[PDB]
Amino acid sequence: ASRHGQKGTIGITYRREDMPFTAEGIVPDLIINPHAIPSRMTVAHLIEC
């Protein structure tokens, strides 16, 4: 869980290859669902980032 009660569990692990990379070449360690905003309304989370 981040620091806004936005919890949840790993539902699968992908490797660097199958992960979505940026032009930079980076890749994320975590990919959370866009539906975890509107409902709860944790805007600090977006800002923290």
Binding site: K7, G8, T9, G11, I12, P20, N33, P34, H35, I37, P38, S39, M41, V43, L46, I47
Partner: protein, 1425 residues
């Protein structure tokens, strides 16, 4: 099961006769003589002593020895022993009846206190219930205190017939401790009643004088209420806790029998020894304690009965009392084998019905498949693989009677299987498993699945089965149970299975749908602006596992062949599907892509989203289930998913703080609109400070300042939202989710980007918890928004401390009624659950409980399964007479009203046919009878109602099935139709009786459905509106019957439980104590949960007992007329109009001391008492709200004390009204006796209990002259307090439409059948306030159980739990051992048809699957070779 075959026959339990233990049958049963209070140790020797346990009961050491019985341990139960008592004992819980029976009997001769010579006693003795009989008997025998020698006869009141013997006086029995004290009457003879004598009197009560009281000659004698010989439970009932050898730790009950036997011994140590006469009974009350404490312990008597270390000790009772207890926690809900539980994760690549089981848990659980040449080839290689690799097993049980443990056993690799052995294999792919999430209060909360074994330690399920179980994946855990019999596992995939459970029965709509990513993608994919090309399309096409193997021709070819989204998503939607919507601006050529049209599993126009694909009623999921099946529909989910995911997986969708930042102008334009919204507040804060505010009908200037303020900031926040809302582009992710339904309502947009808003506590803005202020940060009396907690900032901007805090307050308010709430919610859930239960639909389509009582005569008033129902419009009750005739009227004799021949092929030679018109008038005569009738059912005019068989679709399918064209004429006759439709209203059976009473009640269940039928299947409709053909019209008829037959409820359905949950489920959603009227006091009404808690308890005293009075038909819209009836109902006391009550010393009653009165006496003299005058000033204001005049007031007082209080009064034209009265040896003290009567005991005009009467203008919709349903508003009074018995009888009102939220009253006055109705309406609105909808059936059922009996049986302990159900059913709820006691005390008999009894006996309860037998037909097996 239980090891070792026994010769004795296998039979189930049918009856259970409750009774009591007779000492004579106690001594015949026992085998051990029990006399010694030790345990083992024959002087330390490792065995047991022949005194306590082991005297011939059950052993411990692992010794066969149990009086040769061998077996031992796990095969021999417990053998009972007895313990001779030196002196009789009171049974702890039989105290009340032992007192009651003594009060009901005379000593010395032992006989009923009242013979049949007493007539009032006959009525009591006539009652055919041993419960209530002994109840009315005790109310009559509590008065008598003399043994009557001679009694008045049946003839004359001077002659007497003799019956009983010597007539000693009888005592008044009170309880104290464990004995009974009495007082013979000349100063009381105070002595205690001995257990030794009570039995001597209880033995001597006649054989017929038992049965008259609730007792039995055989099973339960009032003499066996007193313990003479105490039976002793074996070890299995109070088993030790052994630690090897030379270490023993025994159960508590065991210590009890020691302490009892040690007391009983010290007793017989005084009898046969030098006893101190009355120092014996000192220790006799000890034996009365220990034997009374060994059964019960939370008694009235304060001694708790500790064992050293301060241990309350579990008396047998506590072992059974609900929760954790033997009955509830150990019999109704056992812990189980073959079960598992872990963290659930979502998996968008499994089908709906599937559930990914971790490989480990599949290695652990097992299924015992019986070896047959059908499976030998497989099951053997399984056994070979052992219990380590997945496809394998962990036991092999030969038919002999002994297992083979594969994880050991030298012969795991060898092993020959044989035809008939049970292999215990691992759970495998495609086995049936009951899957479940707690808290379980749905059918949905428990559903069967298909095990698909996977790696990784999570249970996996399908996103779209999330809302039934109510799951997220933030850490939830779920239970899994694995069936064990081929017959049992079948009972799962044929009922419990997931697809079978899609059409939720409690709300007549599909409970599963499409959610989140798949639902937010399907919108993005659909928009015509979304296009897909060759390479990607092919993947998507391969992705659907039902793809016809033919790539569809591209919606676009031109320069480059592109496909549309809609074009390929339609690969997921099967063939033959039809869906019509039309949202707002939907026109066959929607300019906004609104609504939806699906013909032949193809999208034609309209973006797909929630309304279409969600759990909506008129959606795609609903259709495909009724149109194609549960098997074919579950697959539909997977298709939509597998594809949409794949696209989204490549398209991408996100959210950032950028999705909550509005324009430069738009933001300023918001802050400006909150600016004028603040000055709008300030001004109407100065208005209120310069005392210029109007009062409002809504009470209190201060209350009307708050109303005004809240409604300015709430109004401001909301239109500040609609600004940012609209400023948001179409390429805004947050707005994109709002549209697709996936998550996020508009306020979430409003608060985030625009303005948080006003926070509230209890209903009003924050209070002055700081003495005239909210935070120490403000000055006193700062009544403006920011002081009173209006957060102006948007979450993005960020709150300020005051805002932050005042926002924290308004947040906590919920968390609290999620804590105080849940407790009482689950107890109303469990109550209903247990109250209904046994109620099931029987094969005669009745609806009966376990007793065999009818509750509904046809389940839910029509005999239809709730799952098969939709909100279809009744077109016959709507519209105007003008529209009606322009629509349902075919006149073949009229040139301008005939079916234009351009319709029917046979129409041009029909104009005029007199014969055809006689069967074309009868269509109308009935269509009109339908209207007149319906408008009298639904008086609202409401047309949309729950009915089986959606016809719009069943017809629209015929529209696109046979491709009918609206250009070329039809081939039906008018005789085809009218005689067709009619011949359908004889095929839609529900009941099926041979005779009158059934077939005349059968007509009734169909009556409504048929109106719907004549509504759509009329001539001017069928031909002109839809163009059906002889073929398609016959097909529609052929369908409608079938789908109506499939709509009928199945005998077996356990509606009781089903109906219960359906109310306790949304009752769980209900917000506790919200109060949307707190703030506007003096007009508060109970809402939500506590309001329900009231109804379910048949509550006498209620918080808001309003009773609505309607006006007389004519004088209903007249304002003043309304305030004339008002002033005739409101309880107006002299106290209401009085200002000041003064007392003067006016000595000369010919001229008043007060010069403001001089003018009064002149009159009341122009035209001997006492000098103490009593002045009363009445207010002119109040005296004209309730139309009264001085004369009327004065004439009323003068006739209360009548002609002994000298009363006078002024007129109606003096600056001050006055009532002066004088009185006629301390007369200043009698002038106050009467000061209080002139107030709280004198009525002027009004009904008592009716304080406050408010007038309100209601909207009523009514049949207009022209026919339309029109808004005609009446005046109606409301009230506080109830007096239905009288308000009704008042003139000027409509005494036919009077109503009270006190349904319990509308029983006592209007008769139980009206009470029922009132009770239902009172339930409905409680569940309808939440915004929750429950199908009439579920509620009506609960409503019926509360009435049928005769009165209003509460759904609590006092209510349904006292009824005539079997003992063991009523004892599974609240009062347990308290009922069991009385059960055997009155020789009760349990029928054992109840769910609970057979569940307690671990047998197959007659419930659905078990509502019958299935025997082998000898004469249909002989034919099959």
């Amino acid at each position: 099961v239980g090891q070792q075959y026994s010769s004795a026959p296998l039979r189930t339990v049918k009856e259970v006769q409750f009774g009591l233990f007779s000492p004579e049958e106690v001594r015949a049963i026992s085998v051990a003589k029990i006399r010694f209070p030790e345990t083992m140790d024959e002087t330390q020797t490792r065995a047991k002593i022949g005194g306590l346990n082991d005297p011939r009961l059950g052993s411990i050491d692992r010794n066969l020895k149990c009086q040769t019985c061998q077996e031992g341990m796990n095969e021999c139960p417990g053998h009972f022993g007895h313990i001779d008592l030196a002196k009789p004992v009171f049974h702890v819980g039989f105290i009340a009846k032992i007192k009651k029976v003594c009060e009901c009997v005379c000593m010395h001769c032992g006989k009923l206190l009242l013979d049949e010579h007493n007539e009032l006693m006959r009525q009591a003795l006539a009652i055919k219930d041993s419960k209530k009989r002994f109840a009315a008997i005790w109310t009559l025998c509590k008065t008598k205190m003399v043994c009557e020698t001679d009694v008045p006869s049946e003839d004359d009141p001077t002659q007497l017939v003799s019956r009983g013997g010597c007539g000693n006086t009888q005592p008044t029995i009170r309880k104290d401790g464990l004995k009974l004290v009495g007082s013979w009457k000349d100063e009381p003879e105070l002595r205690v009643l001995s257990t030794e004598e009570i039995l001597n009197i209880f033995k001597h009560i006649s054989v017929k004088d038992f049965t008259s009281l609730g007792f039995n000659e055989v099973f339960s004698r009032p003499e066996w209420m007193i313990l003479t010989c105490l039976p002793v439970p074996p070890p299995p009932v109070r088993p030790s806790i052994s630690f090897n050898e030379s270490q023993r730790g025994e159960d508590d009950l065991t210590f009890k029998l020691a302490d009892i036997l040690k007391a009983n011994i010290s007793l017989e140590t005084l009898e046969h020894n030098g006893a101190p006469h009355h120092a014996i009974e000192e220790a006799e009350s000890l034996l009365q304690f220990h034997v009374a404490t060994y059964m019960d312990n939370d008694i009235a008597g304060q001694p708790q009965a500790l064992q050293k270390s301060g241990r309350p000790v579990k008396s047998i009772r506590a072992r059974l009392k609900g929760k954790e207890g033997r009955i509830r926690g150990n019999l109704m809900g056992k812990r189980v084998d073959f079960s598992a539980r872990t963290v659930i994760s979502g998996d968008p690549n499994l089908e709906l019905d599937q559930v990914g089981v971790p490989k480990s848990i599949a290695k652990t659980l097992t299924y015992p498949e019986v070896v047959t040449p059908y499976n030998i080839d497989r099951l053997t290689q399984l056994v070979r693989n052992g219990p380590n690799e997945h496809p394998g097993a962990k036991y092999v049980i030969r038919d002999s009677g002994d297992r083979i443990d594969l994880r050991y056993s030298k012969r795991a690799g060898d092993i020959q299987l044989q035809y008939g052995w049970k292999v215990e294999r691992h759970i495998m792919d495609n086995d049936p498993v009951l899957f479940n999430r707690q808290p379980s209060l749905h059918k949905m909360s428990m559903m069967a699945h298909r095990v698909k074994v996977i790696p990784y330690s999570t249970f996996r399920l399908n996103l779209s089965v999330t809302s039934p179980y109510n799951a997220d994946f933030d850490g939830d855990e779920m239970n899994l149970h694995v069936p064990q019999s081929e017959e049992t596992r079948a009972e799962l995939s044929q009922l419990c299975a997931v697809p079978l459970q899609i059409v939720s029965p409690q709300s007549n709509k599909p409970c599963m749908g499409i959610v989140q990513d798949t639902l937010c993608g399907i919108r993005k994919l659909t928009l015509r602006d979304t296009f897909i090309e060759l390479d990607q399309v092919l993947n998507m096409l391969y992705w659907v596992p039902d793809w016809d193997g033919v790539i569809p021709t591209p919606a676009i070819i031109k320069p480059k062949p592109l496909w549309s989204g809609k074009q390929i998503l339609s690969v997921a939607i099967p063939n033959g599907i039809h869906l019509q919507r039309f949202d707002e601006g939907t026109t066959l050529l929607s300019p906004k892509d609104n609504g939806m049209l699906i013909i032949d599993g193809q999208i034609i126009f309209g973006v797909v989203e929630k309304k279409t694909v969600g759990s909506s009623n008129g959606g795609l999921i609903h259709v495909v289930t009724r149109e194609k099946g549960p098997q074919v529909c579950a697959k539909l989910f997977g298709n939509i998913q597998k594809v949409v995911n794949f696209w989204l997986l490549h398209n991408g969708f996100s959210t950032g703080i950028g999705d909550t930042i509005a324009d430069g102008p738009t933001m300023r334009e918001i802050t400006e609109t909150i600016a004028e919204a603040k000055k709008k507040v300030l001004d109407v804060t100065k208005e209120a400070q310069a005392n210029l505010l109007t009062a409002k009908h809504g009470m209190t200037l201060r209350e009307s300042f708050e109303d005004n303020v809240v409604r300015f900031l709430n109004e401001a926040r909301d239109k500040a939202g609609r600004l940012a809302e609209v400023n948001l582009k179409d390429l805004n992710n947050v707005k994109q989710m709002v549209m697709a339904g996936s998550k996020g309502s508009f306020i979430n947009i409003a608060q985030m980007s625009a303005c948080v808003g006003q926070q509230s506590v209890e209903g009003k803005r924050i209070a002055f918890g700081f003495v005239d202020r909210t935070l120490p940060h403000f000055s006193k009396d700062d009544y403006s928004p920011e002081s009173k907690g209006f957060v102006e900032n948007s979450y993005l901007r960020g709150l300020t401390p005051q805002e932050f805090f005042f926002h924290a307050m308004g947040g906590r308010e919920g968390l609290i009624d999620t804590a105080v709430k849940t407790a009482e919610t689950g107890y109303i859930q469990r109550r209903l659950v247990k109250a209904l239960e046994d109620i099931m639909v029987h094969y005669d389509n009745t609806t009966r409980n376990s007793l065999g009582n009818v509750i509904q005569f046809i389940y839910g008033e029509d005999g239809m399964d709730a799952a098969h129902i939709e909100k279809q419009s009744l077109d016959t009750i709507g519209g105007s007479d003008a529209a009606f005739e322009k629509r349902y009227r075919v006149d073949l004799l009229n040139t301008d009203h005939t079916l234009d021949p351009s319709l029917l092929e046979s129409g041009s030679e029909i104009l005029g046919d007199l014969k055809l018109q006689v069967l074309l008038d009868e269509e109308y005569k009935q269509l009109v009878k339908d209207r007149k009738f319906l408008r009298e059912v639904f008086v609202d005019g409401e047309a949309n109602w729950p009915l089986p068989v959606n016809i719009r679709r069943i017809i629209q399918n015929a529209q696109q099935t046979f491709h009918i064209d609206h250009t070329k004429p039809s081939d039906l006759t008018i005789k085809d139709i009218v005689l067709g439709v009619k011949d359908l209203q004889e095929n839609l059976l529900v009941l099926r009786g041979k005779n009158e009473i059934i077939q005349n009640a059968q007509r009734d269940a169909v009556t409504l459905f048929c109106c719907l039928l004549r509504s759509r299947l009329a001539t001017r409709r069928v031909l002109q509106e839809y163009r059906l053909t002889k073929q398609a019209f016959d097909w529609v008829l052929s369908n409608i019957e079938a789908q109506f037959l499939r709509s009928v409820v199945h005998p077996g359905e356990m509606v009781g439980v089903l109906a219960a949950q359906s109310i306790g489920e949304p009752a769980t959603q209900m917000t506790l104590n919200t109060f949307h009227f707190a703030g506007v006091a003096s007009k508060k009404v109970t809402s939500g949960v506590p309001r329900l808690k009231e109804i379910l308890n048949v509550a006498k005293n209620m918080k808001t007992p309003s009773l609505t009075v309607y006006l007389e038909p004519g004088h209903a819209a007249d304002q003043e007329q309304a305030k004339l009836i008002r002033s005739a109902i409101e309880h107006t006391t002299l106290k209401s109009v009085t200002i000041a009550s003064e007392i003067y010393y006016d000595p000369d009653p010919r001229s008043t001391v007060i010069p403001e009165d001089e003018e009064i006496i002149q009159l009341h003299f122009s035209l001997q008492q006492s000098p103490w005058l009593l002045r009363l000033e009445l207010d002119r204001a109040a005296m004209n709200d309730k139309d009264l005049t001085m004369g009327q007031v004065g004439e009323r007082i003068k006739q209360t004390f009548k002609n002994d209080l000298f009363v006078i009064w002024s007129e109606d034209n003096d600056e001050k009204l006055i009532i002066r009265c004088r009185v006629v040896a301390e007369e200043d003290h009698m002038l106050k006796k009467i000061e209080n009567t002139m107030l709280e005991n004198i009525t002027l005009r009004g009904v008592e209990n009716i304080e406050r009467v408010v007038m309100m203008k209601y909207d009523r919709k009514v049949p207009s002259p022209t026919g339309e349903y029109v808004k005609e508003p009446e005046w109606v009074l409301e009230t506080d307090g109830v007096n239905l018995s009288e308000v009704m009888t008042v003139p000027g009102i409509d005494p036919t439409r009077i109503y009270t939220n006190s349904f319990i009253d509308i029983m006592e006055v209007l008769g139980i059948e009206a009470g029922r109705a009132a009770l239902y309406k009172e339930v409905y609105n409680v569940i309808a306030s939440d915004g929750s909808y429950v199908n009439y059936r579920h509620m009506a059922l609960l409503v019926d159980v509360m009435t049928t009996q005769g009165g209003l049986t509460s759904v609590t302990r006092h209510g349904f739990n006292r009824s005539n159900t079997g003992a063991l059913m009523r004892c599974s709820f609240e009062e347990t051992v308290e009922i069991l006691f009385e059960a055997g005390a009155s020789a009760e008999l349990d029928d054992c048809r109840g769910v609970s009894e057979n569940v307690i006996l671990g047998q197959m309860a007659p419930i659905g699957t078990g509502a019958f037998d299935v025997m082998i037909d000898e004469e249909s097996l002989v034919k099959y070779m």
